[PDB]
Amino acid sequence: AELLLGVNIDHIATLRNARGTAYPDPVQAAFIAEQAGADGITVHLREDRRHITDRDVRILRQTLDTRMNLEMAVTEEMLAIAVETKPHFCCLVPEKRQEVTTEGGLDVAGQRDKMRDACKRLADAGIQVSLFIDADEEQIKAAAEVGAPFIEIHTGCYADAKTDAEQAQELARIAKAATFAASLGLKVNAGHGLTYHNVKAIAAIPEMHELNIGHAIIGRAVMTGLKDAVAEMKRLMLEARG
Amino acid sequence: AELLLGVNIDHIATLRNARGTAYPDPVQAAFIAEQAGADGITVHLREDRRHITDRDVRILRQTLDTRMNLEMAVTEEMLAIAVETKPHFCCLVPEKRQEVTTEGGLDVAGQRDKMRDACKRLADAGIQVSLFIDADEEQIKAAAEVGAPFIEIHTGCYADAKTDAEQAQELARIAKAATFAASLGLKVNAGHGLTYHNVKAIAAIPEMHELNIGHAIIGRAVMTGLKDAVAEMKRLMLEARG
Amino acid sequence: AELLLGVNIDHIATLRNARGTAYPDPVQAAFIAEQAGADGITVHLREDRRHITDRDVRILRQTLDTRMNLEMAVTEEMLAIAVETKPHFCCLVPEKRQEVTTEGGLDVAGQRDKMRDACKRLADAGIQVSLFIDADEEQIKAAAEVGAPFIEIHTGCYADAKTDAEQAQELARIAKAATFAASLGLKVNAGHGLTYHNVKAIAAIPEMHELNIGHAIIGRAVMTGLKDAVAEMKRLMLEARG
Amino acid sequence: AELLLGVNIDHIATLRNARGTAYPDPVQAAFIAEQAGADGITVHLREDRRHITDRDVRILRQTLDTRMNLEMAVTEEMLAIAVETKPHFCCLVPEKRQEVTTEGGLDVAGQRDKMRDACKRLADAGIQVSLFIDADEEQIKAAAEVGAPFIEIHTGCYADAKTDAEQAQELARIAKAATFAASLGLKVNAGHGLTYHNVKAIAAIPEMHELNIGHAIIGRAVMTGLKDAVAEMKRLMLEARG
Amino acid sequence: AELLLGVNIDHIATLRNARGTAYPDPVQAAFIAEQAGADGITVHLREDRRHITDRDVRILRQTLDTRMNLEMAVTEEMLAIAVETKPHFCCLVPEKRQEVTTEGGLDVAGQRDKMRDACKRLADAGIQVSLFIDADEEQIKAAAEVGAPFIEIHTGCYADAKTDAEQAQELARIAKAATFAASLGLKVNAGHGLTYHNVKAIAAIPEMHELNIGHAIIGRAVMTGLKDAVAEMKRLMLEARG
Amino acid sequence: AELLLGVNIDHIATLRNARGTAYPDPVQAAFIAEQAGADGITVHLREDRRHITDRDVRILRQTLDTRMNLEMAVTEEMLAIAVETKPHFCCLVPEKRQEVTTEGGLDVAGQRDKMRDACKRLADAGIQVSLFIDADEEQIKAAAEVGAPFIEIHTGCYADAKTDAEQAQELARIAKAATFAASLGLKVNAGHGLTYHNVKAIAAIPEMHELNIGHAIIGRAVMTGLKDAVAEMKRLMLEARG
Amino acid sequence: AELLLGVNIDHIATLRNARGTAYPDPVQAAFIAEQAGADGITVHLREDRRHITDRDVRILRQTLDTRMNLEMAVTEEMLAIAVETKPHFCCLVPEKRQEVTTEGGLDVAGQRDKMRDACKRLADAGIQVSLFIDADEEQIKAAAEVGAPFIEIHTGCYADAKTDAEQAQELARIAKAATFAASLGLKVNAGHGLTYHNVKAIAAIPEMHELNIGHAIIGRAVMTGLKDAVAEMKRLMLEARG
Amino acid sequence: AELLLGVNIDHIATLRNARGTAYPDPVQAAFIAEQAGADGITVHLREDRRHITDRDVRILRQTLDTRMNLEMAVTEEMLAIAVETKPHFCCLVPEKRQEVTTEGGLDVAGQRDKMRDACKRLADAGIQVSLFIDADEEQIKAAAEVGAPFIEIHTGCYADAKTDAEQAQELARIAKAATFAASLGLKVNAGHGLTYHNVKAIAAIPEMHELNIGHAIIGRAVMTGLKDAVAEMKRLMLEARG
């Protein structure tokens, strides 16, 4: 069971929206990445459409050769959109202060009914749901209890570690959380903030299923090209596992 | 006298500022482009520091191997900064509705004193000033009258042409403006909005001195890498001239 | 301007339809071509949707950064599809033997009424029409009379030339045909069957506006990759005109 | 233990044939592939020679540097050619409806006389025979009972699996079919319809001797070139066993 | 018109023959070079089949996409092989003491009877003949009387030029000889011995039709690979005429 | 430990010597290969200096960054050259009828006196000696008694193996012979005749110390360039031991 | 973690200072290395600023995406510079002969007071200290006693080993030294003089934390380019530990 | 008319020497450069052999495939070596203060006896001599009066020009100096300190025969590799003349 990699192309759109032209087109990047080590493409459809737009989602859904992971907030609009779109995966994320925790994860343990409804609903649509949460066992437990098949652990605190001791600390937390989530029947993803220098430690955690990385790749891309940027990340990820 | 190309790296910073990390770093891109066909690097130091930051300007000024073109508004702050920085070039641009025209060019013909002061001031600092203006002969004339050594014609209307007839129209206007500006002792640049498909027609206009292109290059870069993106643009630009 | 390259990506889809998978996708090929030297993308919507399908046209129309040239037979179905799709260019080709001539181009001189009608109806939709015809003065004069802004000379016979003498003769004929056509106010294209070894003599012809090439490019792509295949064809074309 | 890759270049030919030209030439693709990770080259010599032709087989036979794997229907014409051509391997496949099962595999269970004879005849010419069958125990036993050295499991259903569950269900089917086939002294292959995204789980299966892949490889090749298409596939395969 | 390049791939077979293996296979080099700047492929079927063998010719004749230039001695064996093979071109070269010049080229002045017969016989077969001679007037007049449509000047002496004077003189000798041949209605070629550093002076000679180079190309190819080697040669040649 | 690769660059000089030119120059190949996977460079100073010449050895001895493996016949001339040259290694090979085996390797069992003298004399000079012998016990015992520290098994017969049976047997023969040699205190090498498709089985033999390959590498290099050719071989070797 | 690579870019600046230009700039090299396999960048601020200057350190400190390892002599000037610069790592090296030992590493066992002081003062600035010393137990025990968290074993002698025996001996010594050092709670690095051909034996040593390499990498960069030079060194290092 | 490029590989050696190793080796750089656009290779054999050494010159002389240009001070030691070494070109340069003018050039005007003798002596050994002088009429006349075939104008001041005006002033100086030098029968060169950014204006100057560049090329090479560094420079030079 190879460690999978989902490439988030959101920032290709960031770059496009700055001038309101058609380029660069997320649709092209998706092709490059899928053929360069990406097992899935991730797009976050924000409410304010900062980058990825409804057009993007609509055409990508028809052009992706692998599968879509729709990052979105738990709101009527987005729930409706995802059910309509039928993405293979859906990643629920906070987008406001009430749904967010002190670390930026989805507050599941405090919104059990809302999350329960959302999960069954997305599941009836044939969508595999992933609740984006902190390496918090309480949230991890609640996630399991509301029926999500996946949870994506927030690796941002780890990415932003200011000292090695602080980083090693966040690593351990993440690792124990993953092990705990698995013992609950959850498959577990991570990836937020991961870079070419801190990706290996996470990739090594056995419970990890897939890593959703975006920015570091797109940031490497402007220099070296998307093909090599994605390929390097996948190479490093597999090395971590061997 | 080879047609020169200045690569605007602003959007590398756009990409960086989206997540507040250090990468991608404009400093790296500047190296790649200078060695890939760029005769100068252009950075726009906006008042709100959307992308390029004071850090950027400060280090770039020490790392560029060619020369800096500081795009900036005519305000006390920016005038002070540029005098302090001593860029080789300075490109005055509108950033508000009063300094802008109906086309987005710097309103020179209506602010002669402000522009006159700015030009002599930047010139005393040893800076070669370029007034960013529309292909308007009135503005072109005023630009000459206030003492600017350069003017950069706004090629955006041309870039955004919706029909070929409309485009050919904007081309002619641009070409006659350039010829007119030259007969006034001005050296003339262009470049805003130019892309890999419409760059040749502009590059062919003999009066053109240097083209300041940014977005299309950076947008091509996320796919192919900055090296080739800059090189392709310079290749197309020189073909236009032969 | 300079000789333009219209890349026909039909065979990308013949490879696809040979299996029923979604790969390779013409949408990707189009992006690669548009960035490798192609000034337009061409697709031939056959009545039997043998390669290019309606889905290809619908999506391509939204993804192309340049413009679409739609080759199609002159039937109510296609004209309706074409009027609705609104591509920049349209090239009317024969699909049935009662449509073809001795050498293989559209038969305009014999179907002036239908052709006059088509041209009018497509031009009304804002589409610029081109009639694919043999290097035949009769057909060329008729193309003009019916209102077409373009004609595309069928370069097959020249590409199929079995001897050096037969080739030089076909060449001369194409060139004299092009000049005549121009004298009638027509803009002229070509490209069918053109290859890496025989494209220069055609590109050297001054009246040539755009060369639409497919098979030879795709044929080189399977070995080399589309990016280089296209850039090569383009390079050769511009060398011929210098 | 060392997983071999067998590249099928049939679709290089389909491309060519869609036009009647000499290119792209299968003979070229074989050199490229044999030097990019291919251990053998496969060609399916169909009755209607829709792609690979008698010339191809005649020249490929004198130009391959590794070995030929002739795919063919069980007929007198083919057996006769195979015996004469003396290819290293031979893969008996269904071309007609009365010789194919309900899922696609060659119907050996229901043609034991025909197959027993094919095998003895081909084996008598020093050709190692493989029967292209479904992952079905009844067919595998017939295969062994008749004497074939090899069998090639049809991964068609696994490749076409719509849901993840449906895919895992089909994987287990193949893996148990292979283990079983091995217990009866058969060497087992696969490959039909495998892609850069599903090949690994099949390559992980121990009993696999050689994987015969074609379409996905050629489909990647029109984009990246045959060399990298072939080298990637090989790399993924060995990664799966590592 | 277009200055052409014939690539002699003889030395590919030279590397092969030093071992009795099948690699490297001339057939592969051919595809590579024709797709990288070669306009024709040249092979010299020596009597002793030192490198090129009958199978090479037999198969190349079937795989070449451009055309064959068969270099050969004048012997009944070779004339029959040539008439059977029907290569597009035939270059008659000296292989024995009695047929050579002290300078190395074919002694046509001394074998007027033989050569006349060869030119006629090869001509009725539809083969364009070239005589490999020295930049000598007597041999050129001989070549002319005998009926050869082409001549290939021996650029050997120029290539081994020891001083800058010695070289400039041989250059001049060829330039005049080429003009002399043309005034006689002969088309002229050269190439033998030409390298990456001395080719341009020869390519610049107006009367030159095609350059038949092999050894310096193969010698560069062992380091950089055939493709770039061939492409690089072609480029230097085109640079010479620009 | 590390399985090593000695690259025989003899055939570089073979291409050169076919013309008396200075290119390709063995000295260049050496730098290329040592920097691409070679751990040593091997040259065979034949008596007739067919390829490698004294200057090659004289200069290589000065430019090599790793070390020289001098292949040579046992003659007073060569022993003196070797003692003078002081290459790190010396591989004694058969060049005349009286010194060869019907299989091709050095006949040590038949020249015990001569070989013993060579090993001692070359040894006092500080050269590690290897005897090029067949995978034969009598020759190995002979090599052992005479004092040679190394032996290089002749993988020729295995390389020219006609069937999969013939090959598997020669493999087995070498594997056992290698173990036999080691039990005698000899270090063992091989390589001759090994290609990109048969090298792995040999590299996997535990007792193998270094593989001295040349011809298949040069033969691949003519197409792809030395660097990738060498690097690719090295990789296959490392893959074999993993 | 995995063996880390510390790339020393000092020689980038020795190339620069050899002329007084601004190129090549170490700032660029650092970016290339950080993206090619380097986990840290090393610079040696010599008292004579022979290559790396203060400007290099000041800017690098702001541009590096990983972390700075500053090599420096133990003087008040450097310590003050180091305390202020706050690099992640500091490696104390001898610059004067009253600082060096027999083999060339720092002399800690003889200057325990100064070293205890340094370590304390640098650790107080938050810098992690490493003492560059020979593979000498006495020096290692003293490094520990004075408080250093790291030591870097001087691999020069092993890299300079004039014979295989001298090399294996130096190796064994380094390995035994590393183990001892570890038993004292010290983390151990190495790398001086390490090359592409001798780096594996050192990387294979388990106690090795990071390898700091410069000269050999830069030496390969002038030929190959930094990106590949680094990626190669890295590749070799990770192969050694697998 | 055909501008030649002469690459100086002195700094490849400075790199090497800064460490006492064998690499990087100048012999390697010369092959790379000679095959990437260099028409000759230059080496400055200084008195203190700080970079290029007697070994280098001795081996480079037997390995160059184009020709050697020996830069040296006018002394007995050097003349003697030059005469023996028999380099194709020789460039007399100042190494001491009493032999250099106020701007840098060789003082010929003030050492007519010394120079007249050097020239006659070197010329007597078949060496073409060039005097490295300033763009100063007094020195150019002395150069011609003494007999030197060539002169190499020192572009040092133009390269170091601080302001644009100062640069144009220095350019005109060089261009008039060259035209003048030409009128006296001298062949004129340049190159010192030229970069990828200022080389073109110098290459545009008609009278220029060969440009000798080194530092900028090697400085680009540590980043991109010597091949592209050399090929870019050549490309820019020819673009300037085109």
Tab-separated table of N, CA and C in Angstrom, chain B residues 131-212:
chain	number	residue	atom	x	y	z
B	131	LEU	N	7.868	57.318	-17.146
B	131	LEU	CA	6.489	57.636	-16.785
B	131	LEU	C	5.608	56.631	-17.544
B	132	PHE	N	4.852	55.819	-16.801
B	132	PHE	CA	3.964	54.795	-17.376
B	132	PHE	C	2.701	55.489	-17.859
B	133	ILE	N	2.476	55.534	-19.171
B	133	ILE	CA	1.319	56.254	-19.705
B	133	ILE	C	0.600	55.573	-20.874
B	134	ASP	N	-0.600	56.063	-21.205
B	134	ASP	CA	-1.391	55.526	-22.326
B	134	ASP	C	-0.760	55.966	-23.647
B	135	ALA	N	-1.123	55.279	-24.728
B	135	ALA	CA	-0.621	55.640	-26.054
B	135	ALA	C	-1.415	56.884	-26.435
B	136	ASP	N	-1.200	57.944	-25.671
B	136	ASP	CA	-1.895	59.208	-25.837
B	136	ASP	C	-0.854	60.265	-26.189
B	137	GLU	N	-1.005	60.941	-27.325
B	137	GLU	CA	0.027	61.907	-27.658
B	137	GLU	C	0.092	63.079	-26.681
B	138	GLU	N	-1.037	63.448	-26.086
B	138	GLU	CA	-1.029	64.541	-25.122
B	138	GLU	C	-0.169	64.171	-23.904
B	139	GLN	N	-0.356	62.958	-23.391
B	139	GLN	CA	0.408	62.490	-22.235
B	139	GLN	C	1.857	62.311	-22.627
B	140	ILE	N	2.078	61.782	-23.829
B	140	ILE	CA	3.419	61.589	-24.342
B	140	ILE	C	4.173	62.923	-24.394
B	141	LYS	N	3.484	63.970	-24.858
B	141	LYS	CA	4.056	65.319	-24.958
B	141	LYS	C	4.367	65.889	-23.573
B	142	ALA	N	3.401	65.770	-22.665
B	142	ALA	CA	3.568	66.255	-21.301
B	142	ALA	C	4.747	65.549	-20.636
B	143	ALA	N	4.850	64.241	-20.872
B	143	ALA	CA	5.936	63.425	-20.325
B	143	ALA	C	7.258	64.036	-20.740
B	144	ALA	N	7.371	64.375	-22.021
B	144	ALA	CA	8.606	64.976	-22.515
B	144	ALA	C	8.833	66.315	-21.822
B	145	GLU	N	7.783	67.135	-21.779
B	145	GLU	CA	7.866	68.466	-21.180
B	145	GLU	C	8.254	68.487	-19.698
B	146	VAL	N	7.933	67.437	-18.940
B	146	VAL	CA	8.327	67.426	-17.531
B	146	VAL	C	9.730	66.852	-17.308
B	147	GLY	N	10.423	66.490	-18.385
B	147	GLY	CA	11.783	65.985	-18.249
B	147	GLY	C	12.068	64.501	-18.050
B	148	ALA	N	11.092	63.626	-18.269
B	148	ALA	CA	11.344	62.201	-18.103
B	148	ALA	C	12.200	61.717	-19.275
B	149	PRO	N	13.171	60.837	-19.024
B	149	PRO	CA	13.997	60.355	-20.141
B	149	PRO	C	13.309	59.203	-20.875
B	150	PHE	N	12.410	58.540	-20.154
B	150	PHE	CA	11.655	57.400	-20.655
B	150	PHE	C	10.158	57.524	-20.373
B	151	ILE	N	9.387	56.744	-21.119
B	151	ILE	CA	7.948	56.612	-20.930
B	151	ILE	C	7.730	55.148	-21.312
B	152	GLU	N	6.812	54.502	-20.610
B	152	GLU	CA	6.482	53.129	-20.906
B	152	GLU	C	5.030	53.177	-21.356
B	153	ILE	N	4.792	52.834	-22.618
B	153	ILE	CA	3.445	52.839	-23.160
B	153	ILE	C	2.649	51.667	-22.584
B	154	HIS	N	1.395	51.927	-22.228
B	154	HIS	CA	0.527	50.910	-21.662
B	154	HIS	C	-0.027	50.015	-22.770
B	155	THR	N	0.434	48.767	-22.821
B	155	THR	CA	-0.012	47.817	-23.837
B	155	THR	C	-1.182	46.958	-23.380
B	156	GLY	N	-1.762	47.286	-22.230
B	156	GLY	CA	-2.903	46.532	-21.726
B	156	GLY	C	-4.135	46.544	-22.629
B	157	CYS	N	-4.528	47.711	-23.138
B	157	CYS	CA	-5.691	47.761	-24.015
B	157	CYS	C	-5.499	46.831	-25.198
B	158	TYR	N	-4.280	46.806	-25.725
B	158	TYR	CA	-3.943	45.939	-26.848
B	158	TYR	C	-4.024	44.460	-26.433
B	159	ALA	N	-3.420	44.139	-25.298
B	159	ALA	CA	-3.424	42.777	-24.796
B	159	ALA	C	-4.863	42.273	-24.662
B	160	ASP	N	-5.740	43.118	-24.121
B	160	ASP	CA	-7.126	42.737	-23.899
B	160	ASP	C	-8.065	42.873	-25.076
B	161	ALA	N	-7.536	43.187	-26.253
B	161	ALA	CA	-8.367	43.329	-27.447
B	161	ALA	C	-9.291	42.119	-27.595
B	162	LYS	N	-10.572	42.385	-27.822
B	162	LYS	CA	-11.571	41.328	-27.948
B	162	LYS	C	-11.737	40.793	-29.357
B	163	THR	N	-11.379	41.599	-30.351
B	163	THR	CA	-11.475	41.191	-31.751
B	163	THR	C	-10.173	41.582	-32.443
B	164	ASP	N	-9.846	40.911	-33.541
B	164	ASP	CA	-8.622	41.225	-34.261
B	164	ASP	C	-8.605	42.648	-34.805
B	165	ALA	N	-9.763	43.146	-35.220
B	165	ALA	CA	-9.835	44.507	-35.736
B	165	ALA	C	-9.532	45.476	-34.596
B	166	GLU	N	-10.046	45.164	-33.419
B	166	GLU	CA	-9.828	46.020	-32.262
B	166	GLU	C	-8.350	45.991	-31.885
B	167	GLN	N	-7.755	44.810	-32.009
B	167	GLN	CA	-6.356	44.621	-31.681
B	167	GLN	C	-5.456	45.349	-32.662
B	168	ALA	N	-5.734	45.202	-33.954
B	168	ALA	CA	-4.927	45.862	-34.973
B	168	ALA	C	-4.995	47.363	-34.719
B	169	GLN	N	-6.174	47.810	-34.298
B	169	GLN	CA	-6.399	49.209	-33.987
B	169	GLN	C	-5.443	49.663	-32.885
B	170	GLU	N	-5.455	48.958	-31.756
B	170	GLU	CA	-4.584	49.283	-30.628
B	170	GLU	C	-3.098	49.185	-30.977
B	171	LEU	N	-2.762	48.315	-31.922
B	171	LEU	CA	-1.379	48.145	-32.367
B	171	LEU	C	-0.906	49.427	-33.054
B	172	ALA	N	-1.699	49.886	-34.016
B	172	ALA	CA	-1.373	51.085	-34.776
B	172	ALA	C	-1.199	52.286	-33.869
B	173	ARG	N	-2.134	52.442	-32.937
B	173	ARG	CA	-2.102	53.544	-31.991
B	173	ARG	C	-0.775	53.517	-31.243
B	174	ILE	N	-0.463	52.346	-30.691
B	174	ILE	CA	0.774	52.149	-29.950
B	174	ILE	C	1.994	52.506	-30.801
B	175	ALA	N	2.036	51.983	-32.024
B	175	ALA	CA	3.144	52.247	-32.933
B	175	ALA	C	3.302	53.733	-33.258
B	176	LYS	N	2.210	54.415	-33.584
B	176	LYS	CA	2.340	55.835	-33.892
B	176	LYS	C	2.769	56.621	-32.656
B	177	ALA	N	2.264	56.229	-31.488
B	177	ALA	CA	2.627	56.917	-30.253
B	177	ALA	C	4.136	56.804	-30.042
B	178	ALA	N	4.664	55.589	-30.151
B	178	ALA	CA	6.092	55.344	-29.985
B	178	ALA	C	6.904	56.253	-30.908
B	179	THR	N	6.558	56.245	-32.196
B	179	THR	CA	7.259	57.087	-33.165
B	179	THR	C	7.226	58.568	-32.722
B	180	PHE	N	6.049	59.013	-32.274
B	180	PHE	CA	5.881	60.371	-31.813
B	180	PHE	C	6.740	60.642	-30.587
B	181	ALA	N	6.712	59.752	-29.600
B	181	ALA	CA	7.523	59.963	-28.401
B	181	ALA	C	9.018	60.075	-28.737
B	182	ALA	N	9.499	59.232	-29.647
B	182	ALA	CA	10.902	59.251	-30.049
B	182	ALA	C	11.278	60.602	-30.668
B	183	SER	N	10.375	61.166	-31.464
B	183	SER	CA	10.647	62.449	-32.106
B	183	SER	C	10.717	63.562	-31.074
B	184	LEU	N	10.509	63.202	-29.810
B	184	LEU	CA	10.543	64.142	-28.687
B	184	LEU	C	11.750	63.853	-27.786
B	185	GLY	N	12.599	62.922	-28.202
B	185	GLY	CA	13.767	62.610	-27.402
B	185	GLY	C	13.531	61.590	-26.297
B	186	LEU	N	12.372	60.945	-26.314
B	186	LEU	CA	12.073	59.945	-25.297
B	186	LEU	C	12.466	58.571	-25.792
B	187	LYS	N	12.889	57.704	-24.881
B	187	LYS	CA	13.194	56.326	-25.252
B	187	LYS	C	11.894	55.695	-24.810
B	188	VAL	N	11.402	54.701	-25.534
B	188	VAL	CA	10.116	54.155	-25.149
B	188	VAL	C	9.973	52.648	-24.880
B	189	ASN	N	9.413	52.356	-23.712
B	189	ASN	CA	9.190	50.985	-23.306
B	189	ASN	C	7.712	50.639	-23.350
B	190	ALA	N	7.423	49.354	-23.177
B	190	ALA	CA	6.060	48.845	-23.180
B	190	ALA	C	6.149	47.512	-22.463
B	191	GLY	N	5.080	46.720	-22.497
B	191	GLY	CA	5.144	45.413	-21.868
B	191	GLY	C	3.993	44.918	-21.015
B	192	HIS	N	3.194	45.831	-20.475
B	192	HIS	CA	2.093	45.411	-19.627
B	192	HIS	C	1.076	44.550	-20.373
B	193	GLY	N	0.826	43.353	-19.848
B	193	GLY	CA	-0.152	42.462	-20.457
B	193	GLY	C	0.350	41.631	-21.619
B	194	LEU	N	1.545	41.926	-22.127
B	194	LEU	CA	2.086	41.160	-23.262
B	194	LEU	C	2.227	39.690	-22.907
B	195	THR	N	1.941	38.824	-23.874
B	195	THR	CA	1.975	37.374	-23.675
B	195	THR	C	2.784	36.681	-24.781
B	196	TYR	N	2.919	35.367	-24.690
B	196	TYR	CA	3.681	34.673	-25.695
B	196	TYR	C	3.013	34.738	-27.061
B	197	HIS	N	1.736	35.098	-27.115
B	197	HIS	CA	1.098	35.162	-28.414
B	197	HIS	C	0.973	36.553	-29.010
B	198	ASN	N	1.020	37.583	-28.178
B	198	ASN	CA	0.910	38.923	-28.726
B	198	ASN	C	2.183	39.751	-28.509
B	199	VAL	N	3.261	39.110	-28.065
B	199	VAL	CA	4.488	39.863	-27.839
B	199	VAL	C	5.189	40.289	-29.135
B	200	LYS	N	5.186	39.414	-30.143
B	200	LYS	CA	5.858	39.728	-31.401
B	200	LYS	C	5.472	41.035	-32.092
B	201	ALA	N	4.182	41.307	-32.241
B	201	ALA	CA	3.769	42.551	-32.883
B	201	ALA	C	4.368	43.803	-32.213
B	202	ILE	N	4.494	43.786	-30.887
B	202	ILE	CA	5.046	44.934	-30.162
B	202	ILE	C	6.553	44.966	-30.314
B	203	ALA	N	7.171	43.809	-30.155
B	203	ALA	CA	8.617	43.708	-30.288
B	203	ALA	C	9.101	44.241	-31.629
B	204	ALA	N	8.265	44.153	-32.663
B	204	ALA	CA	8.630	44.628	-34.004
B	204	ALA	C	8.702	46.142	-34.152
B	205	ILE	N	7.940	46.861	-33.326
B	205	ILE	CA	7.923	48.329	-33.353
B	205	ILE	C	9.339	48.785	-33.051
B	206	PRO	N	10.035	49.346	-34.055
B	206	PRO	CA	11.426	49.798	-33.888
B	206	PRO	C	11.742	50.704	-32.724
B	207	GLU	N	10.857	51.645	-32.425
B	207	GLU	CA	11.143	52.568	-31.340
B	207	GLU	C	11.254	51.920	-29.965
B	208	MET	N	10.667	50.734	-29.809
B	208	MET	CA	10.692	50.040	-28.529
B	208	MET	C	12.105	49.804	-28.061
B	209	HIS	N	12.344	50.112	-26.795
B	209	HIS	CA	13.663	49.948	-26.205
B	209	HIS	C	13.746	48.687	-25.353
B	210	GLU	N	12.813	48.564	-24.419
B	210	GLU	CA	12.763	47.426	-23.516
B	210	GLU	C	11.325	47.061	-23.185
B	211	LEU	N	11.053	45.773	-23.017
B	211	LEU	CA	9.703	45.345	-22.664
B	211	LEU	C	9.687	44.802	-21.242
B	212	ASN	N	8.793	45.349	-20.430
B	212	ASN	CA	8.662	44.921	-19.063
B	212	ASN	C	7.488	43.976	-18.968
